[PDB]
Design a binder for this molecule. Structure first.
Ligand SMILES: NC(=O)C1=CN([C@@H]2O[C@H](COP(=O)(O)OP(=O)(O)OC[C@H]3O[C@@H](n4cnc5c(N)ncnc54)[C@H](O)[C@@H]3O)[C@@H](O)[C@H]2O)C=CC1
Ligand SMILES: NC(=O)C1=CN([C@@H]2O[C@H](COP(=O)(O)OP(=O)(O)OC[C@H]3O[C@@H](n4cnc5c(N)ncnc54)[C@H](O)[C@@H]3O)[C@@H](O)[C@H]2O)C=CC1
Ligand SMILES: O=C(O)[C@H]1O[C@@H](O)[C@H](O)[C@@H](O)[C@@H]1O
Ligand SMILES: O=C(O)[C@H]1O[C@@H](O)[C@H](O)[C@@H](O)[C@@H]1O
Lengths: 469, 469
C-alpha cells in the first residue's frame, strides 16, 4: 500500500503533471498506489479530481485517486506528502497569487519597486510574502507537526515557496523529514544547446542554494568548457534575443554575473541578481532583453492573469467531461494531458527512487552536512544527490564554488534566509523593519513603518497582523 | 636588548603616549630599552624626537630614543613594531586625513552622504579609504614582509586603520605575527558609572569584531545586571545629553541597538549602526543628541582641523624646547606630557606582558580559532585575551553573542571585510563597484562608475589608479 498525497491538488502548475507522471511510471502505476488529492478550494478540488480520474483512465493506469478536503485525512499514514499549496484568505481572494499582487502594489506605492519582497538576490516574483512568508511557513510547519504524529516515515516534498526558507525552518524547528524541490537546474541544457554541445558529452555539476545555483563544473572532451562560453559571449551574445519573458539563461545579465563570479548562474539564479539589473523596467530590458524578464510590472500581471484563466478553463473542462464522458482528454488537449512522455520534473523520480530503488541523480534542497565546507552543516542547500531505496547521498562538489560566489552571493542570501526565519519565529515587527533598513530602496525609517502599516492593514492580512501584534 | 619601533612616530594621537608609558613602566624603563621613532615627515619626526627626548629626561628614565627616516632600520631586529602610520601623497598633502576628507567630499558630490567609505555598520570616519584602503593595506603588508626577513620574532602591533581589514589581510596573506589594537572596550566604564556600579564589583565581558563589540556578559551581585540598564533607559535616558561629539555610549542609538540585539554595543560600535541612525544630520541628532555624533559634515572637519593645529603646535613646541632647554614640559603642558599616571592604552601593557611576563587581560584583534564557534577559525575578532611571556590565551566567551548579533551584525560586517580584502587583492575595480551596488545610497550603476572615476582621478590617487588599471 503506497499513499501519495498532494496538498494543494487544485494547483494549476503541478496537480495533473504529478498524476500523469505517476500513472506513466511502471513501478508506481499499480492498484496499490493511492493518490490523495487534497485542497481547501472545493470547485478546484472537484475539477482536479474529475480530470485526474478521466486522465488516468485514458492512460489505462490502475492507480486509485481519492479526493478529500481534510488535511489530516491526506496526511494520515502517507508515504509521500507533496506540498504545492498556496494559502489565501477566501473571504477576499480566490488564490494565493492575489495577496502577493496586492501587497506588491502597496510596496510600490511607498517607493519599493516590485514590492518589499523583491530584494537583492531575491527578485523571483512571489517567492516570499511580506518577507517572513507567514501563511506559507505556517502551513508547512502545521503539515510537519501532523506528519510526525500521523505519518512518521513520510517524506514532506516541499514545492510551495519560499522553498529555501520553508525547508530550512521545518528541518531546524521540527526535524520533520522535509526535502525541498525545484527544477531550475534544467537551465544547463539551454547552455549546452546554444554552445552546440551534445549534453551526454558534457561533464557538469551545479550547486548552491535554491534559486542561487551555479555551474561549478562544465567540462567537455576532457577540458574546461568555459572557454566555449567565452567565445559565445564574444561572438553571439550581441545577437541574443529572449524567446519569451522567461528566457534569461543566456542573457546579458547572466553573462555579466558569470564574468564577475567566474561561474554561470543557472536558472532562476539569473533572475536573482543584484539591483544592478533591476533598478527599473528600462534597466531590466537592457540586461534581459525586450520583455525585461518576467519580474516586472508589465509581464508579471500578464502571467498571473494567464494562470487565473487556466484555472477557470480547467474547471469548465471538468464539467465538459461530466457532460461528454466519451471525449478523450489526451486527444483534445494533449498540452494539458500528455501521453507517453514524462514531464521531466523531479517529484515522481524521487518517489520511485525511495519506494522502488530506481536510483537517480537529482538536485534537491537538503542540509549541507559539509558538502560546501565553508557553510554551516544545517543550512539547506540545493545540491546534486543520488537517491535510492535507502538514503539521499550528496555528491562531492568539485570544483568548489568560487570565493566571490561565497562572500558576495551565497552568504548574503543565506543571511537573508536567517533574517526571514527570525522575522517569522520572533513574531517581532522590528525584525521586518531591520530587513527593510538593509534595503537600498529605503529612504527613511518613517517610510518603513508606513509601508508595513499599510500592508498589515490590508483586510486579508488580519491573521498576519494579529500574529505580529 | 629590547627594540620597540614606532612606525609613524609623528603621530599626534600615539607617539608621546607610547613614550611616556614606556618611560613610566618599571620593567621597561631601562638602558637596554631602545625606542626607534620612524616617520617619512621630517619636520614631524624631528619634533616628536626632540619632545620625546626632553620628556624622557624629565621622567628620569634611561631609555634610549633613536630617530630614523628608514623603515628598514626601524624594523631590523625589532622586538615590537607599532604601526601608527597614516600614508599620504606628499606632493599634495601633509597628512593622511586629507585624502579621506577630499574623497569624502567627492562621494557626497555624487550623492553618498559622508562618502562611499561610510557604510552600514561602518560609519567610523577614516576607517577605510576608497573601500579597499589601498595605501594603508599596502604599507602594513610591506612591513609584514620585511618583518619576516629582518625581525622574525617581532610582534606587529597594528593600530592604523582599518584595523580589522589590515590585521585579517596580513594574517591571511603573510602569516606575519600581527595583532590588532583598539581600546573601544573602555566604553563599559561609562555604563557602570551611569548605573552607579563600582566597576570592581561588575563581572563583565565584551566580544565581537573591531568597532563591533558587544557587552555579552554584564553581572552584578550574582545576577544579570541588564535589568539595571532597562531601568536607566526608562528613567534617565530621556534626560541624557552628550558631553561632546564623541559621547555616544548611552545615546538613544546605543539603547535602540540594545533593544533589538539583546546586548549593548560598546564604544565605536555605537557609531557603527545601520543607516537607521545616519540618513542625514537631523537623523544623527535625534539618535546621538545635539552634535549628531562625530561622523558628520559639521563635527568631523572641526576635529580634523583640531588635529592639524595640534601637529603644528607640537612642531613649534619642539623649537621652543631647543631655544629654552630649561623649560619643563611636564610642568607647562601636563596634558601633553603626563607624569606618574599611565595612559591606560593597551600597547605597553602588551609589550610588558610578552617581554616581562606581567600577565594582563587585554582586548585584542586575533584569529577567532573557535572562540565564537559559528564563525571561521581564521577570522580576526576583537576578543578578551590574557597575555603573558608565552602566548595570547583567549577567554571563553560566555554567554555567547545573541543570534541577532550574529546574523544581522557580525556576519554582514565580516562579509564587508571580505569584500574589502577581495577588492584589494584582486586589483579589480568591478569589486569596488559590487560593494557600491550593495550600498543603499546607490541609485544607478552609472552613478557608481562616475563617483569612482572622480575619486580615482584625484591627483593624489595616481598610485591607486595605476594599481587598479
Ligand atoms: N518549487 C517549484 O518548482 C515552483 C514553486 N511554485 C509555488 O507552488 C505553489 C503553488 O503554485 P500554483 O500552482 O501557481 O498556485 P495555485 O493557486 O494554482 O494552487 C495552490 C493550491 O493550493 C490550495 N490551497 C491553499 N491553501 C491550502 C491549504 N491550507 N491546504 C490545502 N490546499 C490549499 C489552493 O486552493 C490551490 O488550489 C506556490 O507557492 C508557487 O509559488 C510555483 C512554480 C514552480
Ligand atoms: N586603533 C586605534 O585605537 C586608533 C586608530 N587611529 C588610526 O592611526 C593612524 C594614525 O592616526 P593619527 O595619529 O591621527 O595620524 P597622523 O597623521 O597624526 O600620524 C600618522 C604618521 O604616520 C606618518 N607616515 C605616513 N606614511 C608613513 C610611512 N610609510 N612610514 C612611516 N610613517 C608614515 C605620517 O607622516 C604621520 O606622522 C590612522 O590610521 C588612524 O585612523 C587613530 C586613533 C585611534
Ligand atoms: O516565477 C514563478 O512563478 C516561478 O518560476 C520558477 O522558475 C520558480 O522555480 C518558482 O519558484 C516560481 O514560483
Ligand atoms: O574617529 C577617529 O578618528 C578614531 O576614533 C576611535 O574611537 C577609533 O578607535 C579609531 O578607529 C578612529 O580612527
Amino acid at each position: 500500500h503506497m499513499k501519495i498525497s498532494i496538498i494543494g491538488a487544485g494547483s494549476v502548475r503541478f496537480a495533473l503533471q504529478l498524476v500523469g507522471d505517476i500513472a506513466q511510471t511502471e513501478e508506481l502505476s499499480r492498484e496499490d498506489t493511492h493518490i490523495y488529492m487534497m485542497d481547501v478550494h472545493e470547485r478546484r478540488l472537484n475539477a482536479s479530481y474529475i480530470l485526474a480520474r478521466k486522465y488516468v483512465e485514458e492512460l489505462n493506469s490502475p492507480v486509485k485517486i481519492v479526493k478529500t478536503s481534510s488535511l489530516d485525512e491526506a496526511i494520515d499514514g502517507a508515504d509521500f506528502i507533496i506540498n504545492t499549496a498556496y494559502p489565501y484568505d477566501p473571504r477576499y481572494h480566490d488564490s494565493g497569487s492575489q495577496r502577493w499582487d496586492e501587497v506588491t502594489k502597496v510596496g510600490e506605492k511607498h517607493g519599493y519597486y516590485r514590492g518589499i519582497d523583491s530584494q537583492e538576490l531575491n527578485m523571483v516574483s512571489t517567492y516570499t510574502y511580506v518577507l517572513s512568508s507567514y501563511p506559507d511557513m505556517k502551513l508547512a510547519l502545521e503539515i510537519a507537526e501532523k506528519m510526525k504524529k500521523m505519518a512518521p516515515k513520510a517524506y514532506l516534498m516541499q514545492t510551495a515557496n519560499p522553498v529555501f526558507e520553508i525547508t530550512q525552518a521545518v528541518r531546524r524547528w521540527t526535524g520533520a523529514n522535509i526535502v525541498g524541490f525545484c527544477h531550475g537546474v534544467a537551465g544547463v541544457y539551454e547552455v549546452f544547446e546554444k554552445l552546440d554541445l551534445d549534453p551526454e558529452e558534457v561533464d557538469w555539476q551545479v550547486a548552491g542554494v535554491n534559486h542561487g545555483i551555479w555551474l561549478n563544473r562544465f567540462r567537455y572532451r576532457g577540458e574546461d568548457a568555459y572557454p566555449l562560453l567565452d567565445e559565445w559571449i564574444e561572438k553571439k551574445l550581441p545577437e541574443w534575443e529572449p524567446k519569451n519573458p522567461w528566457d534569461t539563461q543566456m542573457s546579458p545579465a547572466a553573462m555579466d554575473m558569470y564574468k564577475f563570479y567566474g561561474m554561470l548562474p543557472i536558472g532562476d539564479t539569473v533572475r536573482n541578481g543584484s539591483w544592478k539589473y533591476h533598478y527599473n523596467l528600462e534597466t531590466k530590458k537592457k540586461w534581459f532583453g525586450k520583455f525585461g524578464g518576467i519580474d516586472n510590472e508589465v509581464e508579471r500581471p500578464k502571467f498571473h492573469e494567464q494562470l487565473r484563466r487556466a484555472r477557470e478553463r480547467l474547471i469548465k473542462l471538468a464539467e465538459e467531461v461530466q457532460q461528454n464522458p466519451g471525449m478523450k482528454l489526451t486527444e483534445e488537449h494533449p498540452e494539458i494531458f500528455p501521453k507517453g512522455k514524462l514531464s521531466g520534473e523531479q517529484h515522481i523520480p524521487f518517489i520511485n527512487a525511495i519506494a522502488n530503488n530506481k536510483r537517480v541523480r537529482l538536485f534537491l534542497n537538503v542540509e549541507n552536512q559539509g558538502t560546501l565546507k565553508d557553510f554551516p552543516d544545517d543550512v539547506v542547500m540545493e545540491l546534486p544527490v543520488w537517491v535510492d531505496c535507502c538514503g539521499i547521498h550528496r555528491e562531492k562538489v568539485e570544483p568548489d564554488l568560487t570565493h566571490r560566489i561565497k562572500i558576495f552571493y551565497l552568504w548574503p542570501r543565506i543571511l537573508r534566509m536567517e533574517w526571514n526565519l527570525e522575522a517569522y519565529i520572533s513574531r517581532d515587527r522590528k525584525v521586518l523593519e531591520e530587513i527593510l533598513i538593509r534595503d537600498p530602496r529605503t529612504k527613511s525609517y518613517e517610510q518603513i513603518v508606513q509601508v508595513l502599516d499599510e500592508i498589515f492593514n490590508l483586510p486579508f492580512n488580519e491573521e498576519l497582523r494579529r500574529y505580529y501584534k
